[PDB]
Amino acid sequence: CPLMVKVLDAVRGSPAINVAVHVFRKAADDTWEPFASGKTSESGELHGLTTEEEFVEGIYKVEIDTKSYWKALGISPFHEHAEVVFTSNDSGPRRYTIAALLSPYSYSTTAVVTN
Amino acid sequence: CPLMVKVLDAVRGSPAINVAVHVFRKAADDTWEPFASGKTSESGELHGLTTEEEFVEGIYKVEIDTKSYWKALGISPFHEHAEVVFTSNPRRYTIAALLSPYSYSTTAVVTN
Ligand SMILES: O=C(O)c1ccc2nc(-c3cc(Cl)cc(Cl)c3)oc2c1
Ligand SMILES: O=C(O)c1ccc2nc(-c3cc(Cl)cc(Cl)c3)oc2c1
């Protein structure tokens, strides 16, 4: 599992469950092309997005549909979504965890890169 | 000043100076049209991006060039940039971002 997503809810103090997540990769013509997607689990995690073979060096965007999440809880949000854009790097063995902490008018994201 | 951007550096404990910021607005054909741009000042603030007349309802993207910022400081960061995407309808927006090499936070302060 080279790429995992974990989403947390800062209002409810809980995993952010059933959040849609879309991953894109930048294509040669500089557009975003769909790559993988899913919904977070009961633990706020999304595994199995891609494989080591498919996850080649490139520019990737992880789009977290925060607005639908807050609307489902009845809370007025600011952002359309949370976007995390990064270049993957094959400098030795690496696994990427993209973590996001959500509030209605704020979000934080960090990358946990491990070998 | 209906749209202001403030950027802070969580490593040095300072405003993030000379950070490029690009604002885009979604057009009718669903593409991102350039809307305004600038650089943060010595206080980490970017004022005068737009006007009340120009800042109409729409979907806006604020792209903060964090990668160039870190690389000018000799750090290889994780993210290409920090992106804040929001719908406007709520008349003065402050978009604040706090930056680390492998992480950032953003918040919106919306006042009348
Ligand atoms: O990958 C995990 O298992 C795992 C666990 C707890 C975690 N808490 C964070 C977290 C906390 C704050 Cl305050 C802000 C942000 Cl962006 C992230 O990320 C986690 C990841
Ligand atoms: O001193 C000011 O004027 C001023 C303005 C905007 C500011 N935004 C922050 C801020 C943002 C995030 Cl995402 C997380 C944290 Cl801890 C802080 O601090 C600010 C300070």
Numbering used by the authors:
A (entry chain B): 10 to 124
B (entry chain A): 10 to 98, 102 to 124
Paste lines from the article:
Hereditary transthyretin (TTR) amyloidosis (ATTRv), caused by mutations in the TTR gene, is a systemic disease characterized by extracellular amyloid deposition caused by misfolding of the TTR protein throughout the body.
Although the complex structures of tafamidis and TTR variants (V30M, D38A, S52P, L55P and V122I) were previously determined, 17 previous studies did not include the A97S‐TTR/tafamidis complex. Notably, the presence of a twofold symmetry axis along the T4‐binding pocket results in two distinct binding modes of tafamidis, each related by a 180° rotation. In both cases, the resonance peaks that significantly shifted as a result of drug binding were mainly located at the dimer–dimer interface, which was previously reported as the thyroxine‐binding site. We also evaluated whether tafamidis and diflunisal inhibited the amyloidogenicity of A97S in vitro, revealing that both compounds equally and almost sufficiently reduced fibril formation. In the present study, we first demonstrated the structural biology of the A97S‐TTR/tafamidis complex and compared it with that of the A97S‐TTR/diflunisal complex.
